[PDB]
Write a protein that binds this ligand. Sequence first.
Ligand SMILES: O=C(O)CNC(=O)C(=O)O
Ligand SMILES: [Mn+2]
Length: 236
Amino acid sequence: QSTVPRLHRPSLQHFREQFLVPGRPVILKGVADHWPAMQKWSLEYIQEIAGARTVPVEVGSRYTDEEWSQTLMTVNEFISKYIVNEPRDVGYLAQHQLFDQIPELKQDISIPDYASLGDGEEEEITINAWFGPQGTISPLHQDPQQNFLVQVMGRKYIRLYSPQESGALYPHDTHLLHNTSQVDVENPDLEKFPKFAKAPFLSAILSPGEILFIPVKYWHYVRALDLSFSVSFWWS
Ligand SMILES: O=C(O)CNC(=O)C(=O)O
Ligand SMILES: [Mn+2]
């Protein structure tokens, strides 16, 4: 159990050799801290630019829950019901291609140059928004591409487990959830999942202007500590 390392604007070669090729997480500083988003994206700005648009919203504590569901509403409705007014349930505008929907917002972000070290096309990079209140939780899971998760507003608590530790994370048996752990990271049932207790991990609090590199297939768990807006870039 240790902290994810933080590096200020490392060279492309240093990132490639020490992090990308070996598949090791790192937080990059001084890279996204000057996105216009970092100063422009307030709730008021998001309402002005996106408020009338329809977005998918996940409702419930964790997508692994039984009562969890997905609905559609405007961004203004999402803010009113799940952020500003004392909300009744946790809602999360998660994993949504908001920048394709609202191209004006693309002007406020940039793809990190480190993504050019991959073997894929820039036109195939997928950019997703993650916008929600304090307390959203994305259960421990792994993704099939590299990721840069950029924090714009608020902070997130992140726990990372290597693919080498997959046995101790008890992936779901069904094919559709095989990329998700059965374990609740922050309150694990150690009578049912004893191997989880000894599995090593990295953790961090990701703050505005920071980029977390999540290597392909690295298991990650994310809880928002404040009202939060993150932007993920999936690339190969
Ligand atoms: O930010 C979150 O809640 C979860 N993020 C991701 O799983 C991701 O960027 O791939
Ligand atoms: Mn993910």
